[PDB]
């Protein structure tokens, strides 16, 4: 009857500053097309702080709901919805307002899953971004060289594995030897711990002919280095620029004045990807990801914060600590919060 | 005998200060697989001043030859070359050192043409660049919105027409009402004189959903504006940035600190194109352009300087005048120089 949820109360890229835990909120009811989902696991996303900062609709003022993705059970559903879905059914979704004990979700955008496991939630945003971007924009083929940044992260792990399944040679960047060992176990050809080995040196000394594809999530100096490392007809996909999201503009500084000249001289491209522009591809991607997840052909690494200082990310209140864990570079795989 | 040719004697983007007219040069002799071409028309190219600046191979010291393209008669040729070519035959080529009375050209890269006309020379660099870039990178299809910058120039006129033949809606920028009237005669849907109409405002008011493809060859403020005007999944092709080539570095200033953010938010791309990376496509492009030019299906506008202050661009010495004419923005169509004989 009553539930907790996170609410953006003030526009800020600092999540603690922007977001309030409300305690005594009414449990909303599903429309005729709508499911009501008991959230069991919610995904933490780099762009949670872009959403809290208001960078999606700068018209929209607080208060508003937050959280992009959830997995759980249908507890209620409208009549139309009850054609395809039933109460107690395991479902996952990508829709704003997952950071709640219960969320209303249009049946038309729900993904049926085999059970409530956090591994299936890793696919909804992180998996589908890597799958659709690389398939529509990567032009991957046997022997291509792929650089993946934030390679041991939520979406990074999927860029790494999908590139390997395409029989590419894969380089992955990360901030620890533990993360390097994770990348090697995923079949990464050249893991780089950029804390102990300068990435620019590795690419100069081991990849003098450069790389065909960059899955670039980090921005700043990592972007500039990826541009310099492009082969003739190379493709840098701008997945994100996490290094800038905490700043007041949300932008990371890049050497952009000489960029059009570098791309002309290499016949090379910088291509942006936003998942919400490729929804016509989402169903097929999520189906193929699930088949690989269930079969064990795809590692779907989940970071529930068990080895963090204050331990497992349990409850809505743990989302503040889980966002900080991400921005401290501490996670291996997808950061997930459990609502028990 | 002896001949005249232009030589780069000093690296600089200032063409007049980089390039000397030699008068005492020996006519080179063709090898077994070579043509010796007597140049009748030579092409002037925005990037002649990047070449004189040494920006292509920054290892190569002066002196070296210059000029990218020629059309003329085979006056001598090697025995193996005589399998495909005959003395007296009309040929065109894209190879360095066209700015000479006579140029040695491998038979393997020469294009046979129906006669020595300047219209055919327009296709070699300007025509093939627009054709190959838009076919390989444009994703043109019916109803796509195409913005062409320098649309009344050498390559611009082809980007404009080839986009109209792909059934696209086409916007063209140029600096005069005469140039705007030339664009309207090519079927341009929306000529813009950017001197008398703010381009940014036209695009915002008349194309609020944005443009699907930009053929961008100007750089600077025009590049910034083109990025802002891109539709969702829009494609900006960097053909060039002529606004920068006279500068010490050859670069034009852009306000592109936010470029990655804008491309991510629109799922849009910025794609470089260099003709020399796509030579496996050149022969098919040139064959198709030639068919359309001979049939009258394609306007191949030539600017021989007949309405410039000092009149027709005649002789190698007129190349200095022809380059200044381009960089003053005066030309309609391809700037060609005639070497009469
Ligand atoms: N375009 C789209 O539709 C879309 C969708 C999903 C995600 N993304 C993007 O993908 C990227 C990764 O997001 P995610 O949610 O999956 O997170 P994540 O990669 O699981 O975690 C972020 C990782 O990035 C690195 N990092 C953190 N703070 C950093 C900083 N200040 N500077 C540099 N590196 C830093 C750290 O790994 P290291 O050990 O490697 O340093 C950290 O583990 C983000 O840019 C996000 O916006 C975009
Ligand atoms: N990527 C490749 O392989 C390749 C191959 C060929 C050509 N290109 C590029 O295509 C572009 C056009 O070259 P082109 O030889 O065909 O010349 P063009 O367009 O026939 O002549 C240049 C035109 O650009 C405009 N312009 C000239 N100086 C300018 C300046 N300082 N600032 C702004 N606009 C200026 C003028 O037209 P307006 O009336 O419109 O101002 C002028 O008529 C250049 O960037 C060239 O490098 C590239
Ligand atoms: C300054 C700035 C700009 C973009 C982003 C960003 C990152 C991401 C994502 F998806 F990569 F995670 N999206 N995303 C984003 C995407 C679309 C919009 S939109 N539709 O309001 O213009 C707004 C933000 C962040 C900060
Ligand atoms: C600083 C700078 C550098 C390059 C150019 C430019 C323009 C053009 C052209 F042909 F497209 F018009 N090419 N072109 C160019 C392209 C590639 C090379 S290369 N040999 O390094 O790959 C060399 C020159 C302009 C300014």
Swiss-Prot record, chain B:
Keyword Secreted set for record: no
GO molecular function, a single term: 15-oxoprostaglandin 13-oxidase [NAD(P)+] activity
BP GO terms, sorted: lipid metabolic process; negative regulation of fat cell differentiation
GO cellular-component term (any): mitochondrion
Modified residues (N6-acetyllysine): 5
Listed EC numbers: 1.3.1.48
Subcellular location as annotated: Peroxisome
UniProt-listed InterPro entries: ADH-like_C, ADH-like_N, GroES-like_sf, NAD(P)-bd_dom_sf, PKS_ER, Quin_OxRdtase/zeta-crystal_CS, Zn-ADH-like_protein
EC class name: oxidoreductase
Keyword annotations: Acetylation, Lipid metabolism, NADP, Oxidoreductase, Peroxisome, Phosphoprotein
Chain sites annotated for binding NADP(+): 155, 175, 179, 194, 217, 239, 245, 273-275, 331
PTM-bearing positions, type Phosphoserine: 269
Reaction(s) catalysed (UniProt annotation): 13,14-dihydro-15-oxo-prostaglandin E2 + NADP(+) = 15-oxoprostaglandin E2 + NADPH + H(+); 13,14-dihydro-15-oxo-prostaglandin E1 + NADP(+) = 15-oxoprostaglandin E1 + NADPH + H(+); 13,14-dihydro-15-oxo-PGF2alpha + NADP(+) = 15-oxoprostaglandin F2alpha + NADPH + H(+); 13,14-dihydro-15-oxo-prostaglandin F1alpha + NADP(+) = 15-oxoprostaglandin F1alpha + NADPH + H(+)
Segment forming the signal sequence: none
Family indicated by similarity: Belongs to the zinc-containing alcohol dehydrogenase family. Quinone oxidoreductase subfamily.
Role summary: Functions as 15-oxo-prostaglandin 13-reductase and acts on 15-keto-PGE1, 15-keto-PGE2, 15-keto-PGE1-alpha and 15-keto-PGE2-alpha with highest efficiency towards 15-keto-PGE2-alpha. Overexpression represses transcriptional activity of PPARG and inhibits adipocyte differentiation.
The name this protein goes by in its record: Prostaglandin reductase 3
The organism of origin for this protein: Homo sapiens
């Amino acid at each position: 009857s009553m539930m907790q949820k996170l609410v953006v109360t003030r526009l800020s890229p600092n999540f603690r500053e922007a977001v309030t835990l409300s305690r005594d909120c009414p449990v909303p009811l599903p429309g005729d097309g709508d499911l009501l989902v008991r959230n069991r696991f919610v995904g933490v996303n780099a762009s949670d702080i872009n959403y809290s900062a208001g960078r999606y609709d700068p018209s929209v003022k607080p208060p508003f709901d937050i959280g992009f993705e959830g997995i759980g059970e249908v507890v209620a559903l409208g009549l139309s919805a009850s054609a395809r879905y039933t109460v107690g059914q395991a479902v996952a979704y990508m829709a704003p307002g997952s950071f709640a004990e219960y969320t209303v979700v249009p049946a038309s955008i729900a993904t049926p899953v085999p059970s409530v496991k956090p591994e299936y939630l890793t696919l909804l945003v992180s998996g589908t971004t890597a799958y659709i971007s690389l398939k529509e924009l990567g032009g991957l083929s046997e022997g291509k060289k792929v650089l993946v940044t934030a390679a041991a992260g939520g979406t990074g792990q999927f860029a790494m594995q999908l590139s390997k399944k395409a029989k590419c040679h894969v380089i992955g960047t990360c901030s620890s030897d533990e993360k390097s060992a994770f990348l090697k176990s995923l079949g990464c050809d050249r893991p780089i711990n950029y804390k102990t080995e300068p990435v620019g040196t590795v690419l100069k000394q081991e990849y003098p002919e450069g790389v065909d594809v960059v899955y670039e999530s980090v921005g700043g100096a990592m972007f500039d280095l990826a541009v310099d490392a492009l082969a003739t007809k190379g493709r840098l996909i701008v997945i994100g620029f996490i290094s800038g999201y905490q700043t007041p503009t949300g932008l990371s500084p890049v050497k952009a004045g000489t960029l059009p000249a570098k791309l002309l001289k290499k016949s090379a491209s910088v291509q942006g990807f936003f998942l919400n522009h490729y929804l016509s591809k989402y169903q097929a991607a999520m189906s193929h990801l699930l088949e690989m997840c269930v079969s064990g052909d795809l590692v779907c690494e989940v970071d529930l914060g068990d080895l963090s200082p204050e331990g497992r990310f349990t409850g809505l209140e743990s989302i503040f600590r889980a966002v900080n864990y991400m921005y401290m570079g501490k996670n291996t795989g997808k950061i997930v919060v459990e609502l028990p």
